[PDB]
RNA sequence: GAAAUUGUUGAAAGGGAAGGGCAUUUGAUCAGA
RNA sequence: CGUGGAGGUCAGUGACGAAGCCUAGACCGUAAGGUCGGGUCGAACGGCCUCUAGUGCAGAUCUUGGUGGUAGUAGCAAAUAUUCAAAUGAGAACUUUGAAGACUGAAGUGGGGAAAGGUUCCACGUCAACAGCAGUUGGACGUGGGUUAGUCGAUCCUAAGA
RNA sequence: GUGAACAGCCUCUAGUUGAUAGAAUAAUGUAGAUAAGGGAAGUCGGCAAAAUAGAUCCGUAACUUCGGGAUAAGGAUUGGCUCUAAGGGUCGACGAUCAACUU
RNA sequence: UUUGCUCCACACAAUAUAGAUGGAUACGAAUAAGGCGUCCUUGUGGCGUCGCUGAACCAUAGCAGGCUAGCAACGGUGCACUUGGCGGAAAGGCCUUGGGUGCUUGCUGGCGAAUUGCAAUGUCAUUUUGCGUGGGGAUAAAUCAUUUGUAUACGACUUAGAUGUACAACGGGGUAUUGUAAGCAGUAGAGUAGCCUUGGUUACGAUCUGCUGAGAUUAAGCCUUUGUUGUCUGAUUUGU
């Protein structure tokens, strides 16, 4: 017989399996589509969620009942250092899809990325490029031939970059290396780029820019097994049900006679694989510069990084990117930004935002003082110190 | 780590025990001083004196103590089988307050 | 000192049973002349 | 066709190996089955003509005995709780001693008894089995020792009753 | 000892420290708990849980077989410390001396 | 690495064969239209011709194809080199230069074959592997164990670790929580009970005040570190 009552479904069938994501980090499986008159540029870029804080701006927004009033928004605070490009790879359009046709790398490969081709870096004679450096000997010329291919072919070009973990907190010293696919036309010239960027540094800001809307692309925080209840979000059984209450009651008609995909069942939850869309980017900021955590309106030479550093985290010494509202992923996770793939002219975004606070005080607990020299003022003259 | 050697340490009991069971805690301080013994002096044979036992003990099972300050000696032993040679002894240095104590060689005994 | 059941060795086969019938290939083995 | 036993016969077979058993070795019969080779084995057994029956198993939630998959699986989670060192020992989480931490908290996890048990009491030796882990320990195993009354009970009296 | 108390809790004498252990801390369980705002809308049904609770003082309805109902209902107080007052025995209106708690 | 690994050449062994026995011989498009040739004023042009299947084209003679003598012509073809170009959809192939060299059945000769006994696939191909002989080339990792917690039931995942912007244990600082530690002192303290220099002092006294936003805790899944101390070659396995 029918339900007897009517109810949507527990859960989004477009998000299974919810199994573990195959790797800690997300990969990028859409990048936007290519606008080849514009300049070559990064259509992504790798960074490491710190933690978030809150910020008060002035909102921007006619016909609304806070137009051109405070508003308090919660933000994520991304430790973005520059990534450094260490090779490009050339993609042909087949019958059967994209597939890379080369790769060249760079010349020299830092300590930080070789560290990702070792499962024990310790023990190893760190043998990894030393006769592909070879290929740069007197001209280059097998890695100008390996180029010329990839101008001659290869309709998609993606260069590889690594993170610098090493400016980050983090203990993890083993670099993340990701392809970014180079919009901006004229395979040749994006070549060009790769190989000229070769060996060098790019920096968060010239990828993106204040208030541009963007994707977060992370595996989310884990959790393990769990239950029907909280995986799936289905009704609690009642008080008196034998055999627990934290369950689905009934998984399945008699017929068909095996349990279906779509019934809630218990397993693995959260470690899954999400690109989530349109975050608005508040701020990219730069590591040199000092009142980081400063605005226009604030003026108080505060660095973003909260009082006794980003909980679980560290300090933000390098360029972050501050979004709004919340991405997927845990803080030390490494997370991919990338840009929008489609433009979006709904009035939240186009929305210049323009910070008037950003929250320093200590997220270790209910932290009462932006500065330690707000700390001082008010509290006077301690015993120990100060 | 292949000699004989004596140094005072202070082990924060209170980060080890730190969300264990209270039945529990004062037997997994005993382990994680015999961990704390094996990770410094690098001797699987880790021997616990009855004084430190006690201090251990001092106040129920799970009343231990959040930092202790203890006497680990590295010492050789000469037995039926070899079985790791060297073996650390762990007593209680018995000092006022276990705080602000860092690592220091005896040197004499 | 059987069988059920089991270990080792040897041989063989094995994409959601296995086993069987007719026929022949292949491998092993063997009688009769 | 085959089986247990019986009369006759082959002056049948056999410790130089009967019967039995094993044998993707061979032969004969459409088949029930029969025959042979090899290994194992040790004391009886077979062909034929007849006689005889407690004479042929796949079943009966068949009977007795044995054995699997399940499966090294379920589980060995109530009674607050154990820890350090030494001794003994081949072997110690579990024995002993010492130290510590705890509990029963006198309507006890204390000290005695009635019914019941019958040596479980105690000592020495001792760990194959039992103590659903272990064991050097034990209410275990082996060998011994131990229960002393004119006054405590029975014995005597009568009760319901026999 | 606390306490009205052979209640509960802690301790003394005595006894035991005997329950297979070790490592982690997923789901679902068993047992124990908490929870913003709402307050039975859950459910057959307030099942379960929560709320109340001791003592002192105040106050206590319908009905009634006049005995009860009744701890009805409904209220206030309670610690610590320093004091004060009252309540006795013996010996010869008082004097001496001694002594324990209850209000 | 009890002389390891890989590639090439040769020899010898195995190993099998979803099945060779002359050649898979390359426009595209239309089909109520085309292919080819040719011409011009180059087109959706004129003219000619073809199909009616590949029953074609190429190749094809020689002890499974031997040994030799010539003629004719600078052709055909194989081999190993060599010049250069093109091809990325799975290119791994196509085209091309030059010389060398073998054959040439384009034509004319000489020698040989037999007895596999009248047939018996009468063995001629390619698939991997091993081994030996020479030559060429290179000189790592992974896992267990330890560690991390961005992970986790266990596996798994993510980290770190052979001398350093290393790691760990303490210590310091920051941060945060609580709420003012112990000790000492006090013309504080409701007071009660003694003593006399009757304005003080003795005993007890909840509590109060000051040192004291002090003291305690603070990573166990907080941040940081000019300090102290220590650690850094244990095991197993993997080859085209
Ligand atoms: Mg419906
Ligand atoms: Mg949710
Ligand atoms: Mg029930
Ligand atoms: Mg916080
Ligand atoms: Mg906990
Ligand atoms: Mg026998
Ligand atoms: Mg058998
Ligand atoms: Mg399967
Ligand atoms: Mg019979
Ligand atoms: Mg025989
Ligand atoms: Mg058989
Ligand atoms: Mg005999
Ligand atoms: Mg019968
Ligand atoms: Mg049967
Ligand atoms: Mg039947
Ligand atoms: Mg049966
Ligand atoms: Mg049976
Ligand atoms: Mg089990
Ligand atoms: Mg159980
Ligand atoms: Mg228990
Ligand atoms: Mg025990
Ligand atoms: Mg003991
Ligand atoms: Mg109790
Ligand atoms: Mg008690
Ligand atoms: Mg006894
Ligand atoms: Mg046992
Ligand atoms: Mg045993
Ligand atoms: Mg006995
Ligand atoms: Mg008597
Ligand atoms: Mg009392
Ligand atoms: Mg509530
Ligand atoms: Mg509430
Ligand atoms: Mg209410
Ligand atoms: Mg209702
Ligand atoms: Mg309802
Ligand atoms: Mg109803
Ligand atoms: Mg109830
Ligand atoms: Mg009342
Ligand atoms: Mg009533």
Not at chain 1, 89 to 101: A, D, M
Not at chain 1, 247 to 258: D, E, F, L, R, S
């Given at each position: 017989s029918h339900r007897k009552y009517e109810a949507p479904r527990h859960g989004h069938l477009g998000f299974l399996p919810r199994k573990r994501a195959a790797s800690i980090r997300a990969r990028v499986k859409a990048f936007p589509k290519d606008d080849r008159s514009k300049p070559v540029?990064?259509?992504?870029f790798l960074g490491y969620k710190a933690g978030m804080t809150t910020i008060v701006r002035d909102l921007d927004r006619p016909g609304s009942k806070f137009h051109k009033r405070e508003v308090v928004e919660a933000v994520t605070v991304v430790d973005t250092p520059p990534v450094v490009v260490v090779g490009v790879?050339?993609?042909?359009?087949?019958?059967?899809?994209?597939?890379?046709?080369t790769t060249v790398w760079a010349?020299?490969?830092?300590?930080?990325?070789?560290?990702?081709?070792?499962?024990?870096?310790y023990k190893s004679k760190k043998k990894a490029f030393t006769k592909y450096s070879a290929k740069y000997a007197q001209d280059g010329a097998g890695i100008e031939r390996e180029l010329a291919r990839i101008?001659?072919?290869?309709?998609?070009?993606?260069?590889?970059?690594?993170?610098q973990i090493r400016k980050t907190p983090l203990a993890q010293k083993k670099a993340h290396l990701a392809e970014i696919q180079l919009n901006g036309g004229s395979i040749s010239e994006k070549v060009d780029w790769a190989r000229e960027h070769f060996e060098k540094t790019v920096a968060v800001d010239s990828v993106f820019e204040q208030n541009e809307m963007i994707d977060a692309i992370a595996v989310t925080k884990g959790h393990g097994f769990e239950g029907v209840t909280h995986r799936w979000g289905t009704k609690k059984l009642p008080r008196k049900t034998h055999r627990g209450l934290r369950?689905?009651?009934?998984?399945?008609?008699?017929?068909?006679?095996?349990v279906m995909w779509s019934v809630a069942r218990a397993g693995?939850?959260?470690?899954?694989?999400?690109?989530?869309?349109?975050?608005?980017?508040?701020?990219?900021?730069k590591g040199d510069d000092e009142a980081n955590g400063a605005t226009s309106f604030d003026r108080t030479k505060k660095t973003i990084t909260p009082m006794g550093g980003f909980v679980h985290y560290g300090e933000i010494k390098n360029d972050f990117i501050m979004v709004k509202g919340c991405i997927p992923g845990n803080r030390k996770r490494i997370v991919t930004l990338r840009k929008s793939?489609?433009?979006?002219?709904?009035?939240?975004?186009?929305?210049?935002?323009?910070?008037?606070?950003?929250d320093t005080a200590s997220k270790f607990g209910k932290g009462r003082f932006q500065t330690p020299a707000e700390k001082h003022a008010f509290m006077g003259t301690l015993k120990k110190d100060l | 780590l292949k000699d004989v050697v004596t140094r005072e340490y202070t082990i924060n009991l209170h980060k080890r025990l730190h969300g264990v069971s209270f039945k529990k805690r004062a037997p997994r301080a005993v382990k994680?001083?015999?961990?704390?013994?094996?990770?410094?002096?690098?001797?699987?044979?880790?021997r616990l004196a009855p004084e430190l036992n006690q201090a251990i003990w001092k106040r129920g099972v799970k009343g231990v103590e959040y930092r202790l300050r203890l006497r680990i000696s590295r010492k050789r032993n000469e037995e039926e089988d070899a079985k790791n040679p060297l073996f650390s002894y762990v007593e209680p240095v018995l000092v006022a307050s276990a705080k602000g104590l860092q690592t220091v060689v005896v040197e004499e005994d």
């Open positions: 540029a990064l259509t992504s790879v050339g993609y042909v359009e087949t019958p059967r899809g994209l597939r890379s046709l010349e020299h490969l830092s300590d930080e990325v070789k560290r990702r081709f070792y499962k024990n870096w101008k001659k072919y290869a309709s998609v070009v993606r260069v590889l970059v690594h993170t369950k689905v009651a009934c998984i399945g008609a008699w017929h068909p006679a095996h693995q939850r959260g470690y899954h694989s999400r690109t989530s869309i349109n975050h608005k980017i508040y701020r990219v900021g793939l489609y433009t979006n002219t709904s009035r939240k975004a186009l929305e210049e935002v323009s910070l008037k606070w950003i | 994680e001083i015999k961990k704390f013994a094996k990770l410094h002096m690098g001797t699987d044979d880790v």
